[PDB]
């Protein structure tokens, strides 16, 4: 289920939000 | 159900509730801003009319009286 | 899955709020 490109993009997005706020 | 997964779920819920509360507070402020905006329009009209009518009330009497002597 | 349903509701609410802010 993770392999779906939208799921991967979403996961990288949450990581991006966290890093930007840090 | 790891403790951290439950903490994450509560985190998403907390973020949503915080945005919701901020939305209510912003709407409540916007009502006051609307009231001030309406007052500002009424006062604009009133003050321009008072400017015109006060100028005329001060000057028009003597000006009319002098024009009647011409 | 009540926890997942509440999470989806929260995420959808956040997305809708950001979309409304974009329109504003």
């Amino acid at each position: 289920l993770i392999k779906h490109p939208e799921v991967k993009s979403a996961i990288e997005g949450i990581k991006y939000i966290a890093e930007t706020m840090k | 159900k790891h403790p951290e997964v439950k903490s994450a779920i509560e985190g998403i819920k907390y973020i949503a509730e915080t945005m919701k509360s901020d939305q209510e507070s912003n709407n409540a402020a916007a009502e006051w801003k609307y009231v001030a905006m309406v007052m500002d329009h009424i006062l604009l009209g009133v003050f321009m009319l008072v400017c015109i009518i006060g100028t005329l009330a001060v000057f028009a009497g003597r000006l009319i009286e002098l024009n009647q002597q011409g | 899955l009540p926890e997942l349903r509440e999470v989806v509701s929260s995420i959808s609410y956040i997305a809708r709020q950001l979309q409304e802010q974009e329109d504003h």
Partner: protein
Amino acid sequence: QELFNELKPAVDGANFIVNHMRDQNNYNEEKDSWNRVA
């Protein structure tokens, strides 16, 4: 399948949130560049 049918609005919303944050960050970066030019 149906699990994803229930999780798809959440994935789409998360992607939308991410795109909105990224656009805002780029916008702020350009504003900061203008500030430095000034």
